[PDB]
Amino acid sequence: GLEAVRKRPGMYIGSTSGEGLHHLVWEIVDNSIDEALAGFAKSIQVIIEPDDSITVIDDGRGIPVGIQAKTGRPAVETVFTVLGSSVVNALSTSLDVRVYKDGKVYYQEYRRGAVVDDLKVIEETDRHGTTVHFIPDPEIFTETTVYDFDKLATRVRELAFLNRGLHISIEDRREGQEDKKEYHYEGLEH
């Protein structure tokens, strides 16, 4: 399964250069955009964390957490472990997901694609949505693991335009260069 992704990442993300590094972000963001298209997510945050890891937050319904009859596993686990989202998981040292749903925070983490523990309720919550955080694997991204804020921001702006009505932001939390841009193109209320 995902072991094939780790050994032939070029076949799944096109390049293991800086281009592939950035592609990981778009694979995750595309899931959030699908939840905006479904009509439930209204706001997406993309964050470059101080260690060049990435957090993507949406306020949609939250990935389904119920057990699937076919797999016997929670749907959210299958999202990350069965062969875009699972490709990002495979090519990350660690990926953690938090699903905010029905007053509960469901949490699972993976390491180089492998499950750490069964999905668990860790907290109560009043919000809804999905947060994915991932650390790209330098064993895969041997040229660079350093994100380009302008490159991400340029595409985030384009995505806001193409998904008119969506609020989407990009934030850099790295030392000496903290920045944030927020985008929102108005609908019929304009």
Ligand SMILES: CNc1cc(F)cc2c1[nH]c1nc(Oc3cnc(C)nc3)nc(N3C[C@H]4CCN[C@H]4C3)c12
């Ligand atoms: C950082 N965010 C993020 C990241 C991410 F990797 C996945 C999701 C994600 N946010 C999500 N929200 C939903 O919402 C749904 C809730 N309920 C249903 C029935 N479908 C979708 N579903 C999600 N799923 C379920 C599948 C439907 C199409 N895309 C797949 C991933 C995500």
